[PDB]
JSON list of C-alpha atoms in Angstrom, two decimals:
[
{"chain": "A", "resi": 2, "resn": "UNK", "atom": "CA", "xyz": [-239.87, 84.70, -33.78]},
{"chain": "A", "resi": 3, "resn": "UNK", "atom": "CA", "xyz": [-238.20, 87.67, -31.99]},
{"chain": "A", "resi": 4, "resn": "UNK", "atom": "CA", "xyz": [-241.42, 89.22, -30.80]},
{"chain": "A", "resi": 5, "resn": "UNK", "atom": "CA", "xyz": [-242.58, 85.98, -29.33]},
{"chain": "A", "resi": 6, "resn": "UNK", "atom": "CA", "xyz": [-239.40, 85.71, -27.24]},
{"chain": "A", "resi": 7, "resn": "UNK", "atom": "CA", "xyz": [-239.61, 89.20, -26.14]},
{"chain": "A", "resi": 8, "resn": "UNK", "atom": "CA", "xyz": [-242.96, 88.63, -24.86]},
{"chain": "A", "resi": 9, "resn": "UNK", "atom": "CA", "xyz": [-242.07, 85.30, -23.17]},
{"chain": "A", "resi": 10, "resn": "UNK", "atom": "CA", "xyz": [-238.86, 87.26, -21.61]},
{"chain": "A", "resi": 11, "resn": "UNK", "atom": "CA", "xyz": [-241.30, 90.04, -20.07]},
{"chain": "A", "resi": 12, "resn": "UNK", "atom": "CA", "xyz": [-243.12, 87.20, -18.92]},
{"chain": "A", "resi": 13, "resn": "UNK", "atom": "CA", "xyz": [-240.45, 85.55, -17.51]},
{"chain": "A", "resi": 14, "resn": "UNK", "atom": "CA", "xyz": [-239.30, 88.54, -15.46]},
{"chain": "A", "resi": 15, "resn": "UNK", "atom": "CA", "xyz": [-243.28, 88.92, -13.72]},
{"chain": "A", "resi": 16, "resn": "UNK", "atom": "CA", "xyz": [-242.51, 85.57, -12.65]},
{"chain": "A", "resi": 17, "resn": "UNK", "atom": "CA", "xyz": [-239.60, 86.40, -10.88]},
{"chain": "A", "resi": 18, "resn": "UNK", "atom": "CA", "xyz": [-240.81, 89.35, -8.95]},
{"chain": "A", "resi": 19, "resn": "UNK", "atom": "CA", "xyz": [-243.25, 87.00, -8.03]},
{"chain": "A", "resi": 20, "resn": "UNK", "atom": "CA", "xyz": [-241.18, 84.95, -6.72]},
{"chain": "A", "resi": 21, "resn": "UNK", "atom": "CA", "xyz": [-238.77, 87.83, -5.09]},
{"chain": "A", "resi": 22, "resn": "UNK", "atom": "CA", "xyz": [-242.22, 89.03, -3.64]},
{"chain": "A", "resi": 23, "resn": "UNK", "atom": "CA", "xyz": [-242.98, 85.22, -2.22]},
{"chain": "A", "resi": 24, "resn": "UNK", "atom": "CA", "xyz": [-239.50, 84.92, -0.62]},
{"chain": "A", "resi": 25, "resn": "UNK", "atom": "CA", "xyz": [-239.75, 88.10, 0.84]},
{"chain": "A", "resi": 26, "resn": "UNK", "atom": "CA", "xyz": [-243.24, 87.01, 2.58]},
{"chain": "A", "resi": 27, "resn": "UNK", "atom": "CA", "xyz": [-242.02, 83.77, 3.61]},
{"chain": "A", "resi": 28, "resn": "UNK", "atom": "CA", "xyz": [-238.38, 84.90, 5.25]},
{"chain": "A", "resi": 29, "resn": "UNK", "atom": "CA", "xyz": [-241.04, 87.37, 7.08]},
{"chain": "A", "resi": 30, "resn": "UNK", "atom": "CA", "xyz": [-243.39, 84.91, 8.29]},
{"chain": "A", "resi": 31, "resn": "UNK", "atom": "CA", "xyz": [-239.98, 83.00, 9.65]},
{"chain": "A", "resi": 32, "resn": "UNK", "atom": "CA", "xyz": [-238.61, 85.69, 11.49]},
{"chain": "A", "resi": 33, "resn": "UNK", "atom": "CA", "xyz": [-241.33, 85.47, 13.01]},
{"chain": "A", "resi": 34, "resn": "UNK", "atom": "CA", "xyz": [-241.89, 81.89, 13.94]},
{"chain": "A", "resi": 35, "resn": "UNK", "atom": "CA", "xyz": [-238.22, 81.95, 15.16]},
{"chain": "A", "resi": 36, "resn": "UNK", "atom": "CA", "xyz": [-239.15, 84.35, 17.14]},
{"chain": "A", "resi": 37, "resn": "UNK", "atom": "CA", "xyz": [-242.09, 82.50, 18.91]},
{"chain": "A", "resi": 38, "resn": "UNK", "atom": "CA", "xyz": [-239.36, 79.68, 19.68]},
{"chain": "A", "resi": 39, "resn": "UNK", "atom": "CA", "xyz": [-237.16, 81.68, 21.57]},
{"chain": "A", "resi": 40, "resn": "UNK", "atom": "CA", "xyz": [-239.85, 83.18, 23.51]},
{"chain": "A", "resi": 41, "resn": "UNK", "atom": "CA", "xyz": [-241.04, 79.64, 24.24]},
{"chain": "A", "resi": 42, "resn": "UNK", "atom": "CA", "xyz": [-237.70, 78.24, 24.84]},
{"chain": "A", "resi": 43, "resn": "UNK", "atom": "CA", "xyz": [-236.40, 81.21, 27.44]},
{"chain": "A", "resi": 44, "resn": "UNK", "atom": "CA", "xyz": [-239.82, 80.49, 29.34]},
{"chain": "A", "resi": 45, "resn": "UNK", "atom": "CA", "xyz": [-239.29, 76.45, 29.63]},
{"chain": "A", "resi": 46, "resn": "UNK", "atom": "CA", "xyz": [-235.49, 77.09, 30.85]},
{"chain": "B", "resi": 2, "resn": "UNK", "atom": "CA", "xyz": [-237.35, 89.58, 23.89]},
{"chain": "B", "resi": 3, "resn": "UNK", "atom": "CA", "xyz": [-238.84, 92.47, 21.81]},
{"chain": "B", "resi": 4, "resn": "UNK", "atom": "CA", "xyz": [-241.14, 91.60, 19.60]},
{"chain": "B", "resi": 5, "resn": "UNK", "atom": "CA", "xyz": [-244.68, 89.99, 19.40]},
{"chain": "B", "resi": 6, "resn": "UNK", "atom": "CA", "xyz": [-246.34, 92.67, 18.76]},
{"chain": "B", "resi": 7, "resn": "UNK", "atom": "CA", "xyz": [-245.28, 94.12, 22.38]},
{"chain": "B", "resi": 8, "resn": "UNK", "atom": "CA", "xyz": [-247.53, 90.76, 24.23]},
{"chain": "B", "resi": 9, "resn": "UNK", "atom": "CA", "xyz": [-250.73, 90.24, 24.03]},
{"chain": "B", "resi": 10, "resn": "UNK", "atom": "CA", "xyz": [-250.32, 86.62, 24.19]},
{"chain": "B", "resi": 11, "resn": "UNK", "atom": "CA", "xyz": [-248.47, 86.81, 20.63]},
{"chain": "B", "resi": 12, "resn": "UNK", "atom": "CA", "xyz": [-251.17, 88.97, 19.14]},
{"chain": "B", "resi": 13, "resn": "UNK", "atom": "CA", "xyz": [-251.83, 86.44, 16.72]},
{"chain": "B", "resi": 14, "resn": "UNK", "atom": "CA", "xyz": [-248.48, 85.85, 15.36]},
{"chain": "B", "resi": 15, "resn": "UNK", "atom": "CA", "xyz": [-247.53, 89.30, 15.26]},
{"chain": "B", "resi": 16, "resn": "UNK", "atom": "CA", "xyz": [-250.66, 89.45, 12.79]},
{"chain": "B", "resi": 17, "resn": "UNK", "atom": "CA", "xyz": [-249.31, 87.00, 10.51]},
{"chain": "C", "resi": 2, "resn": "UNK", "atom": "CA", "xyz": [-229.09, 82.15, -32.72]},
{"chain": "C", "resi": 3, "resn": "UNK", "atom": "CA", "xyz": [-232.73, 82.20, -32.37]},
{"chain": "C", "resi": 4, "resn": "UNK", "atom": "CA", "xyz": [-233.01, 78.21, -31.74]},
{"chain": "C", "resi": 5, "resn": "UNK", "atom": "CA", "xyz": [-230.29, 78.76, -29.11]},
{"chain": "C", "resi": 6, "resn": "UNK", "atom": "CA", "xyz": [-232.32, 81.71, -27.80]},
{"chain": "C", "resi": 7, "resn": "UNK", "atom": "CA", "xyz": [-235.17, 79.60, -27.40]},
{"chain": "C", "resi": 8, "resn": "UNK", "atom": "CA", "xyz": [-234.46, 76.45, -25.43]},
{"chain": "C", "resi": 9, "resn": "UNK", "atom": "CA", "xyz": [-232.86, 78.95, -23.22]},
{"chain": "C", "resi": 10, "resn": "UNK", "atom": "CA", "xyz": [-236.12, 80.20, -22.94]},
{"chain": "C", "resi": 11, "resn": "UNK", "atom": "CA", "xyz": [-237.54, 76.81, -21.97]},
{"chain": "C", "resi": 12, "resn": "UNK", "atom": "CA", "xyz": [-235.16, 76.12, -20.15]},
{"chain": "C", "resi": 13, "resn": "UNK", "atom": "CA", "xyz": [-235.57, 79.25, -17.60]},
{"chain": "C", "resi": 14, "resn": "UNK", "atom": "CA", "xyz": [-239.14, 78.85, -17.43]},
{"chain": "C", "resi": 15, "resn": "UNK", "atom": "CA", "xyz": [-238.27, 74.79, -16.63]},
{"chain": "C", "resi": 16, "resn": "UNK", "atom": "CA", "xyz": [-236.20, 76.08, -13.50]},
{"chain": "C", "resi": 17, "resn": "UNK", "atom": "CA", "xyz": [-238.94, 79.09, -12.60]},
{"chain": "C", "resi": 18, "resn": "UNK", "atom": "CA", "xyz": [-241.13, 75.95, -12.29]},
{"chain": "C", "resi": 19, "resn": "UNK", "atom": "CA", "xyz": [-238.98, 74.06, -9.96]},
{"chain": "C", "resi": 20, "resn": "UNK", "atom": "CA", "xyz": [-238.31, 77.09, -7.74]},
{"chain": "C", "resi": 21, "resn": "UNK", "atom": "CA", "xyz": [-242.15, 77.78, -7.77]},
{"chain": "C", "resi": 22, "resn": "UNK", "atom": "CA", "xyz": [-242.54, 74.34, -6.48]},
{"chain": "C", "resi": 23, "resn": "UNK", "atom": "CA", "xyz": [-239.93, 74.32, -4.01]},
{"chain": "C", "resi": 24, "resn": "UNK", "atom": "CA", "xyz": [-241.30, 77.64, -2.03]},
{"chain": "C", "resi": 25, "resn": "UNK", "atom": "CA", "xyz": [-244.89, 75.93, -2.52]},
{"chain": "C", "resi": 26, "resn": "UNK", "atom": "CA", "xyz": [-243.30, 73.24, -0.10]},
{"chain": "C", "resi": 27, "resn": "UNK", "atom": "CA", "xyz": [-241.13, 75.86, 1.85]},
{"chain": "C", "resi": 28, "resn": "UNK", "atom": "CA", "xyz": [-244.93, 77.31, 2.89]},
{"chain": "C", "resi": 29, "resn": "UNK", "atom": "CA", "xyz": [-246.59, 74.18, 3.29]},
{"chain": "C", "resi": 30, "resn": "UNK", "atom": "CA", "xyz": [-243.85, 73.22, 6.41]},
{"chain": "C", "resi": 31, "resn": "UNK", "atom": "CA", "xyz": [-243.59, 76.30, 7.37]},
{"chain": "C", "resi": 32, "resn": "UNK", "atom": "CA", "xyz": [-247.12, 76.39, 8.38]},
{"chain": "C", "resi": 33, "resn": "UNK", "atom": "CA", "xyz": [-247.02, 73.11, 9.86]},
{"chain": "C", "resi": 34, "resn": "UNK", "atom": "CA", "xyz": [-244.46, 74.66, 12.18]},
{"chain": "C", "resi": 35, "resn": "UNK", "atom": "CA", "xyz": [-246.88, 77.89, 12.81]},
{"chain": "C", "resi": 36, "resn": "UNK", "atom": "CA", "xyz": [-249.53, 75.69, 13.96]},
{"chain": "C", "resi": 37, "resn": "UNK", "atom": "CA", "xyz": [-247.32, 73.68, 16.26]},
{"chain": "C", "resi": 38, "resn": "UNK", "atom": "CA", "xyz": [-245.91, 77.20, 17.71]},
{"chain": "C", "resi": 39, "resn": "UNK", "atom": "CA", "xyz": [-249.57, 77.93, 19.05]},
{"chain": "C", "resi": 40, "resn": "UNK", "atom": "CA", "xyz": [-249.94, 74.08, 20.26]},
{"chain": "C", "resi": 41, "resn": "UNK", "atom": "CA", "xyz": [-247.01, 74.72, 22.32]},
{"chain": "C", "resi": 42, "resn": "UNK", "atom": "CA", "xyz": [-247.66, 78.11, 23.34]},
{"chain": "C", "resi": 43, "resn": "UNK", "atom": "CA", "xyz": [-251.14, 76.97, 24.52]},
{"chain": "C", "resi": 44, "resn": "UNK", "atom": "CA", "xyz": [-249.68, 74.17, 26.67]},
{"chain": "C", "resi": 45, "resn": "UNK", "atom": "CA", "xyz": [-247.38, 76.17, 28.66]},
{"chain": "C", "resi": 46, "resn": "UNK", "atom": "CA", "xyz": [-250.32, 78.71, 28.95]},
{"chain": "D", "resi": 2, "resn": "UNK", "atom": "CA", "xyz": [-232.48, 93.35, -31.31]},
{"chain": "D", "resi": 3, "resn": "UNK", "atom": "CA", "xyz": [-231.06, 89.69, -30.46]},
{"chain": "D", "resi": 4, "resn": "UNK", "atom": "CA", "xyz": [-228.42, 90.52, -28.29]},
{"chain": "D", "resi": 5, "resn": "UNK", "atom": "CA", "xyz": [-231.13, 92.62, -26.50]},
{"chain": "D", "resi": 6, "resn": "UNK", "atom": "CA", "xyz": [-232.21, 89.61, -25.63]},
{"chain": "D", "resi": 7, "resn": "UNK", "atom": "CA", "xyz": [-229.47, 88.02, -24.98]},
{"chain": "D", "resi": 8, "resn": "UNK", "atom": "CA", "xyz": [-228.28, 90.65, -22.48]},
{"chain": "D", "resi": 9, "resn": "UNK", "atom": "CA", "xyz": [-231.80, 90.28, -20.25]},
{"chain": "D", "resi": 10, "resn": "UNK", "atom": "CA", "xyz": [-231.34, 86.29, -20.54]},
{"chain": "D", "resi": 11, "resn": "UNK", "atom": "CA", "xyz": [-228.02, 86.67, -18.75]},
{"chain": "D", "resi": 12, "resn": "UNK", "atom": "CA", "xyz": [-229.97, 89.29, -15.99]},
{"chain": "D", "resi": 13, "resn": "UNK", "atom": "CA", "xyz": [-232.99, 86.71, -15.43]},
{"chain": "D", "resi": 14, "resn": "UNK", "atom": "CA", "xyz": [-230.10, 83.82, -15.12]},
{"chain": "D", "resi": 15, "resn": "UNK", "atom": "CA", "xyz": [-228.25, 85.73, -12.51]},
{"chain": "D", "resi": 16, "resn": "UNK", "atom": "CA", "xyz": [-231.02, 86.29, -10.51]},
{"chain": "D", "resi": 17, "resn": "UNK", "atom": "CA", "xyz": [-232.25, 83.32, -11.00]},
{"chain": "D", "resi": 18, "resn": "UNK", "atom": "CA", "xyz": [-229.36, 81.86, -9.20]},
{"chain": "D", "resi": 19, "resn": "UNK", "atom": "CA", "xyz": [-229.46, 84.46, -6.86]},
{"chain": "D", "resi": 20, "resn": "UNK", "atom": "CA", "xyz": [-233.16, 83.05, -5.75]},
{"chain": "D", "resi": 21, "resn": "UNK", "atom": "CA", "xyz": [-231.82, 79.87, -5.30]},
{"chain": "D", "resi": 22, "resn": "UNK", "atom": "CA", "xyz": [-229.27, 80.31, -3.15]},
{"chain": "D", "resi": 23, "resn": "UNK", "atom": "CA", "xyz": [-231.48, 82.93, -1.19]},
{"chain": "D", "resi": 24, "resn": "UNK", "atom": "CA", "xyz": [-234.26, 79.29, -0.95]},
{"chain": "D", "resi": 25, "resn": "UNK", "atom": "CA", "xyz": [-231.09, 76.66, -0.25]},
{"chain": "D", "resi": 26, "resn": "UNK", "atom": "CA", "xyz": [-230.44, 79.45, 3.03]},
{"chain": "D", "resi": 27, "resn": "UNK", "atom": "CA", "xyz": [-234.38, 79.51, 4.00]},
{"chain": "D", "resi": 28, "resn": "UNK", "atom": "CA", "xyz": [-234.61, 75.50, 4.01]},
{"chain": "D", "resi": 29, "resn": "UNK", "atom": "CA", "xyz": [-231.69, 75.12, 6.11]},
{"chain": "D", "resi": 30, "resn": "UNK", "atom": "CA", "xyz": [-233.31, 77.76, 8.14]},
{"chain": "D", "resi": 31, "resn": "UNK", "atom": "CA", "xyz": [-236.88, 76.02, 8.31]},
{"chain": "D", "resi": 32, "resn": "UNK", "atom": "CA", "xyz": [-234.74, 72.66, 9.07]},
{"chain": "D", "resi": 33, "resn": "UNK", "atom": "CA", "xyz": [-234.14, 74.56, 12.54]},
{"chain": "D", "resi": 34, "resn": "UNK", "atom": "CA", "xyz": [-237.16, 75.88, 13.30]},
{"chain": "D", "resi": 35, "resn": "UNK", "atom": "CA", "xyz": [-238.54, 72.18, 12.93]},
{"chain": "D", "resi": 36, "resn": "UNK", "atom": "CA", "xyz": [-236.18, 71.22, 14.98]},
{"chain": "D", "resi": 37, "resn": "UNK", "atom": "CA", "xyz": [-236.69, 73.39, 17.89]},
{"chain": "D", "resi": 38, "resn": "UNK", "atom": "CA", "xyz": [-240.36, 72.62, 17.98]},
{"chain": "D", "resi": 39, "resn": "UNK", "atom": "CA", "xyz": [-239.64, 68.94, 18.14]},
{"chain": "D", "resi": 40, "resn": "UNK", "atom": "CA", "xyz": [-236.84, 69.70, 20.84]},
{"chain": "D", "resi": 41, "resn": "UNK", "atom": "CA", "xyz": [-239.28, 72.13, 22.76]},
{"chain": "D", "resi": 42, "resn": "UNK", "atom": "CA", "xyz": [-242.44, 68.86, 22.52]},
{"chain": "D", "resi": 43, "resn": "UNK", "atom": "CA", "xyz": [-240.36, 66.39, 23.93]},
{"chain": "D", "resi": 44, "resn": "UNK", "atom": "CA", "xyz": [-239.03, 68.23, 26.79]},
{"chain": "D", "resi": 45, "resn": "UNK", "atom": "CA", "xyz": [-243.29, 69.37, 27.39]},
{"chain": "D", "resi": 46, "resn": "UNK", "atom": "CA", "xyz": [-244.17, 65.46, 26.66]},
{"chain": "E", "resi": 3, "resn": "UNK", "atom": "CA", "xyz": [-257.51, 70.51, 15.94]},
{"chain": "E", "resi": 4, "resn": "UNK", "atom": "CA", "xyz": [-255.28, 69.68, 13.33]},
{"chain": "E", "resi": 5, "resn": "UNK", "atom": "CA", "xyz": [-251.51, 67.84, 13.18]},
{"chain": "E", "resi": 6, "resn": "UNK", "atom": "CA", "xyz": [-252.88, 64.83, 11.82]},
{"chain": "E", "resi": 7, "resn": "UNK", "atom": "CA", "xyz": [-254.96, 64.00, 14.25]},
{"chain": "E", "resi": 8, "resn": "UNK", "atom": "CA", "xyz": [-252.73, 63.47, 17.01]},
{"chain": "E", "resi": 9, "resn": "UNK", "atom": "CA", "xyz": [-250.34, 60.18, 17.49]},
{"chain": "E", "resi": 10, "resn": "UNK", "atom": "CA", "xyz": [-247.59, 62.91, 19.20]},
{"chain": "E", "resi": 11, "resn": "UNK", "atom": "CA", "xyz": [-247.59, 65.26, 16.01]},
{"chain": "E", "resi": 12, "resn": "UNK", "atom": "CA", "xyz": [-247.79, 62.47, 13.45]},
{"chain": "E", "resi": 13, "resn": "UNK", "atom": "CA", "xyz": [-244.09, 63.62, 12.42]},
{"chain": "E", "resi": 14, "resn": "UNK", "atom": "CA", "xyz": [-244.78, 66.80, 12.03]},
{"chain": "E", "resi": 15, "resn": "UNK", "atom": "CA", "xyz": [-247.72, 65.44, 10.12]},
{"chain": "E", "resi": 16, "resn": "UNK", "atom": "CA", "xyz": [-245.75, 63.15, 7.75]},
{"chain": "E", "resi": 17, "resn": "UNK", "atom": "CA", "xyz": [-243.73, 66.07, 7.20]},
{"chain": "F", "resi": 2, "resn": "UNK", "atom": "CA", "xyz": [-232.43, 64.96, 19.51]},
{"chain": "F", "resi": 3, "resn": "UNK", "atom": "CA", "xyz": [-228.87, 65.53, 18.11]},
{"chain": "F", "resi": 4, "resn": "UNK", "atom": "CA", "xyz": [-228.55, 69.01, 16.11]},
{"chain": "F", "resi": 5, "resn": "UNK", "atom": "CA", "xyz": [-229.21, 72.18, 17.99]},
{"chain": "F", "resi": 6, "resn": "UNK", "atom": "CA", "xyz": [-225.49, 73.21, 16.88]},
{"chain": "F", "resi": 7, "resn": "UNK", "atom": "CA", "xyz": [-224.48, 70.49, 19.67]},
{"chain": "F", "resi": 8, "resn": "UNK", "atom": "CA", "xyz": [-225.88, 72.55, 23.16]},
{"chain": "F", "resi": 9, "resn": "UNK", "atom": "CA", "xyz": [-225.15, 75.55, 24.30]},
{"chain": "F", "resi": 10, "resn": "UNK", "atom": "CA", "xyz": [-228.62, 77.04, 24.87]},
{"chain": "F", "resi": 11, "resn": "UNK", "atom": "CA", "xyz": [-229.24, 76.26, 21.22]},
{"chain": "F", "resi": 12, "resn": "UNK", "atom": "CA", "xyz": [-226.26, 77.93, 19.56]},
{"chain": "F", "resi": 13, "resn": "UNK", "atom": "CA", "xyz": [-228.67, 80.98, 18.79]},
{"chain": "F", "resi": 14, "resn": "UNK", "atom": "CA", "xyz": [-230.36, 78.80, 16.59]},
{"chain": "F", "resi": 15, "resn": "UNK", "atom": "CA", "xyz": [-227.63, 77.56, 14.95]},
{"chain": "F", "resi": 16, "resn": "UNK", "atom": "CA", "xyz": [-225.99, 80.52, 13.89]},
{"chain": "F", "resi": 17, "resn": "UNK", "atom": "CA", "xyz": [-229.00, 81.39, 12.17]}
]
């Protein structure tokens, strides 16, 4: 029983630098989009 | 301001 | 101590799922805003 | 060999938690962008 | 192409 | 509409 749980613990740590990884990509991508409505917005005013 | 990968019309979102 | 050790273990993998979901949404819209973005961008252009 | 475990459950809980504040901050974030695009069509429309 | 098809933005296409 | 953090050039996009 103690094996199994240390294996589903390892397991459940890859998911969350997954996840860390994911979040990191996605604040990325909005800095960027962010970005692309300033830009827009300072040109239209 | 900065950014955009310096113009280029956006440079295709900076890439992605 | 084991039992307790395990639902604790379902438990975080539960939540890992919700949180998985959630950013699979987070990307979804945030795409939809990408494309919309270029739409703009092309309009003024 | 059990508090072993015990001790990484209470790492992977933190950071869960951690991760979902970090998503809670990037949806009201995303809630903005959306926003602006819909502010910046209307004003184009 | 693409944000439902049109109607304005569909919503944001229906979010 | 209403949001923006109520004018101002858009607040800076609402505080970020």
């Amino acid at each position: 029983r103690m094996k199994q749980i240390e294996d589903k613990i390892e397991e459940i740590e890859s998911k969350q630098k997954k996840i860390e990884n994911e979040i990191a990509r996605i604040k990325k991508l909005l800095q960027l989009t962010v970005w692309g409505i300033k830009q827009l917005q300072a040109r239209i005013l | 301001x900065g950014x955009x990968x310096x113009x280029x019309x956006x440079x295709x979102x900076x890439x992605x």
